[PDB]
């Protein structure tokens, strides 16, 4: 399950303590310096199920297929009771992304033919592009992507290299904007994969756009348990704060 790249990078092996209890990776790409920095290069290349981090691209696909459009991202909650209060309400793109509302994205994916998805995954080079698995191929199933690739895709998205409309990209960015300050925009998305009732796969990917640069990042956690997006985000924030990016 490995992404093969010979790209150079600055090693961040001193970030190891942040990853206590996990086989984790942190990948940073500094846009201005066109430079990667990586903690745990081997793990950086290992592809894992994206879980909710896939929602970023599923949203883009949905825009591209006009499932979503300007002033047209709402979905009404059918009153089905989910485990998370935030899912138990009407949604728009922002809320569905912030709260990782699976049903909203399942509803969008329903209108995407398998071949359309495959086409998009090819265009955006989404990891192994394998979607044979479950209907929810993005959730602890066949589709897997590495931390470095998560960064590459964010970068290609943000730089508008992807063949998605820029306004769609801006909408998706907004939907994953965690903090907007004068000094930076902090964008990120969690994912968590559960196997055997354990959190075994945690993601937090995003970027910090400052007044002069953009720092794309992906943190992955693998562990027997507790490897979840929340912890991945906590760790990411610790690192980004140590780096004085947020």
């Amino acid at each position: 399950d490995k992404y093969e790249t010979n790209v150079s990078y600055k090693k961040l092996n001193q970030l190891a303590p942040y990853f206590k209890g996990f086989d984790g990776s942190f990948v940073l790409y500094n846009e201005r310096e066109q430079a990667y920095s990586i903690y745990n290069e081997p793990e950086s290349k290992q592809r894992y199920s994206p879980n909710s981090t896939y929602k970023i691209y599923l949203a883009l696909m949905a825009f591209d297929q006009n499932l979503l459009s300007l002033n047209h991202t709402e979905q009404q909650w059918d009153k089905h009771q989910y485990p998370f209060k935030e899912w138990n309400q009407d949604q728009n793109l922002n809320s569905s992304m912030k709260y990782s509302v699976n049903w909203y994205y399942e509803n969008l994916n329903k209108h995407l033919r398998q071949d359309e998805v495959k086409s998009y995954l090819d265009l955006i080079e989404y990891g192994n592009e394998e979607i044979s698995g479950n209907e929810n191929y993005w959730n602890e199933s066949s589709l897997k992507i590495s931390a470095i690739e998560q960064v590459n895709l964010l970068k290609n998205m943000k730089q508008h290299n992807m063949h998605f409309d820029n306004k769609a990209i801006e909408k998706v960015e907004n939907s994953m904007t965690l903090k907007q300050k004068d000094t930076y925009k902090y964008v990120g998305k969690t994912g968590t994969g559960i196997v055997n009732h354990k959190e075994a796969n945690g993601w937090f990917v995003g970027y910090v756009e400052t007044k002069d640069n953009t720092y794309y990042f992906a943190t992955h956690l693998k562990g027997e348990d507790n490897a979840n997006g929340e912890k991945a985000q906590q760790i990411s924030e610790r690192i980004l704060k140590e780096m004085e990016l947020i």
Binding site: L67, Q75, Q76, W103, Y104, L108, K110, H111
Partner: peptide, 4 residues
């Protein structure tokens, strides 16, 4: 199932 998004409706639109």
């Amino acid at each position: 199932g998004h409706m639109s």
